[PDB]
């Protein structure tokens, strides 16, 4: 979302 | 906005203490969450400039992160376990206030929070 994609 | 100053991690006027439960909070609880694969977004204050989140610090007025918590524990900043527990809860609540369900950061927070709550259920005796 606002912070974007983070999970590999 | 620019980022605010981070939360203090020491205060020469605030009484310091070590307790059984604070030692557990550092050596079991924080340790376990810190090494988790989903810890990294929570290991330092939210950098709303780098993430381009102009409204972060308009929405979140009590920022908290595990880097701050770690340093507070290492510095014997807290007087009791409840202060520390409250900071962890603030960190998670902020994430859920700012971010939307199903965002990666929220999935990450949820996983860390479940682990946190199991460790808190397991808090040792106060003395």
Residue numbers in the entry:
A (entry chain C): 773 to 780
B (entry chain A): 42 to 168
Q: What did the authors write?
A:
Bromo and extra-terminal (BET) proteins provide a recruitment platform initiated by the recognition of acetylated lysines (Kac) by their tandem bromodomains (BRD, Dhalluin et al., 1999, Jacobson et al., 2000, Owen et al., 2000). BETs, like all of the 42 human BRD-containing proteins, contain additional interaction domains that recruit other proteins to the acetylated protein target, forming complex assemblies and contributing to processes such as chromatin remodeling and transcription. Direct targeting of BET-BRDs by small-molecule inhibitors such as the high-affinity and pan-BET specificity thienodiazepine (+)-JQ1 (hereafter referred to as JQ1) enables their displacement from Kac. Multiple decreased interactors harbor sequences that can directly associate with BET-BRDs in canonical or new BRD-mediated structural binding modes, and we propose that the tandem BRDs present in each BET protein may be capable of simultaneously recruiting both a histone and a second interactor.
Based on our earlier work defining the flexible G at the X1 position as a binding preference for histone H4 (Filippakopoulos et al., 2012), we fixed this residue to screen a subset (91) of all 2521 unique K-GX-K motifs found in the human proteome, focusing on nuclear proteins with Kac sites annotated in the PhosphoSitePlus database. Additional peptides carrying a Kac-GX-Kac motif, including those from GATA1, ATRX, POLR2A, and TOP2A, adopted the same histone H4-like structural association with BRD4/BD1. Our structural analysis identified multiple cases of non-histone proteins binding to BRD4 BRDs through histone-like motifs in the same structural template we initially described for H4. Our data therefore suggest that Kac-XX-Kac motifs beyond those found in histones can be recognized by BET BRDs.
